[PDB]
Design a protein around this ligand. Sequence first.
Ligand SMILES: C=C(C)CCOP(=O)(O)OP(=O)(O)O
Ligand SMILES: [Cl-]
Ligand SMILES: [Mg+2]
Ligand SMILES: [Mg+2]
Ligand SMILES: [Mg+2]
Ligand SMILES: [Mg+2]
Ligand SMILES: [Mg+2]
Ligand SMILES: [Mg+2]
Lengths: 287, 286
Amino acid sequence: VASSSLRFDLKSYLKERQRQVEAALNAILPPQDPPLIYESMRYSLLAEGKRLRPILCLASCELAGGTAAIALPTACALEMVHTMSLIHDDLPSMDNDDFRRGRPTNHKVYGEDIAILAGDALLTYAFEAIARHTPEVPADRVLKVIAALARAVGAEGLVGGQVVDLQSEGRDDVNLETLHYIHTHKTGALLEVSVVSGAILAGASEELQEQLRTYAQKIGLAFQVIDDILDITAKATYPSLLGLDASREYADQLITEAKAAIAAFGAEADPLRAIADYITARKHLLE
Amino acid sequence: VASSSLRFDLKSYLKERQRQVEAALNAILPPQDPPLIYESMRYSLLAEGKRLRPILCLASCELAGGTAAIALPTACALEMVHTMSLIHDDLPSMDNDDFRRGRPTNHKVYGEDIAILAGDALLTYAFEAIARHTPEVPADRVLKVIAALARAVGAEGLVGGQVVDLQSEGRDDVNLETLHYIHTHKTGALLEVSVVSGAILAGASEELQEQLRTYAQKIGLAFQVIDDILDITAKATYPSLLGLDASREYADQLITEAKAAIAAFGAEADPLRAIADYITARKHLL
Ligand SMILES: C=C(C)CCOP(=O)(O)OP(=O)(O)O
Ligand SMILES: [Cl-]
Ligand SMILES: [Mg+2]
Ligand SMILES: [Mg+2]
Ligand SMILES: [Mg+2]
Ligand SMILES: [Mg+2]
Ligand SMILES: [Mg+2]
Ligand SMILES: [Mg+2]
């Protein structure tokens, strides 16, 4: 049974929030000098994206009683960090991809040196945007956002995940603990901080923060498990490690835990519920 | 006339402060999981360095009435950012160097992918160390350090400088404006924030912060001008753009402005003065 309001239109909500996010991104990082670095940063940042991390941040902030206005810099920051992770991941020294967000990868247009530096500058600007542009929130909470984002993106999060992912590439012995580590760190950490950052800015209790963290962790993992089921319902995977049946049950357990974490809230949780209902629905429609 | 105390031993002061910084670096970033990323980050971070940016930070904090203790996380952060700039600069796609800090470059040991990621994780950890580990400093000051370091290291500072440096590589038309931009942004920005960050944490006035910023900007530029004079006393340079004589006068004007900026202070400014006296002394001896 879908948790969100029966009429909730997720496609419509995401489209509006995407436009709002993309207008904020354009204004927060305007063309500046030297033109080439700002051109390269904006090339990747403003390329077509779903903007799910910023949208989760704004939604979590609102759910916790805050405004979009206080969260928008942090929302932009999450997208800058996500964008710089893709720029670095696409590089010839990493995945060596020719295409990203429907255009040539940054390094194909600007060279590997400029792409690396554009990534470095977007990572740095994420922290500046939060520190310099976050309105009304007391410094102590903005610093908590800085610390949480930094922990989520570095060796304890996104980069730690990227490293184990790279170490796993040539191997035939990847176990569930490794696969779980990659999903929770390479992708999970930043999803978690996207919702938790919104709650911190709003001044939410540690309890509320932890409920959103659980939501994000479980919905993130449910997404990866269902993705692996879809791949074979058409290199360690949930099916290759658990079998198909236990993968289906795990996905259902993950969605149930995600929905439970935000069960207490009213209509402000509808966007997060709709995201879970959609991922649930895609799971059920194979069975 | 040297501005610092007659007996001030800069070599001794730097060696003691280097030891303190390197102990802090080892404790703030201990080996952790996955081991390979922490090993790569520590490989470059704990390689032989003069540690001038952390030392400037600690010295500036103390000059402003603060302790080394409140500044040590920020000092480590400045060294992390400096270290990640060298890791990325050494990459095949950039300067393609085989050696850094007396050992093989990070990417020669760990591969280009791990070196990139080590650099990204050091950049990130710099902001975490300031925000998480700064001991009992008012949040508003710590947030100003985050904003100032981010501005100093990004497209408005260090990265902006690296980019114009890369764009200048193949050119025969590099003018004084461009050379000045590279020196003030690629190198100057992070020196400036090293001294200003210490002062901010200590709760120094805007005025004091601005005087330390002038000190760092002028001493940084004086260093680059004198380096160019030494190179030909042995590609746009101060001599190739100004000629030798105006380069010498410029260097002396820069050191004079640097010393004037901190003239008012007592013995707590002696380390900054001794750094200026040493750079002056190297100029005059040619
Ligand atoms: C989280 C990061 C660093 C990006 C994911 O890169 P992958 O190689 O896993 O996938 P793509 O986004 O490149 O397709
Ligand atoms: Cl996504
Ligand atoms: Mg990859
Ligand atoms: Mg990829
Ligand atoms: Mg998968
Ligand atoms: Mg270089
Ligand atoms: Mg170099
Ligand atoms: Mg030179």
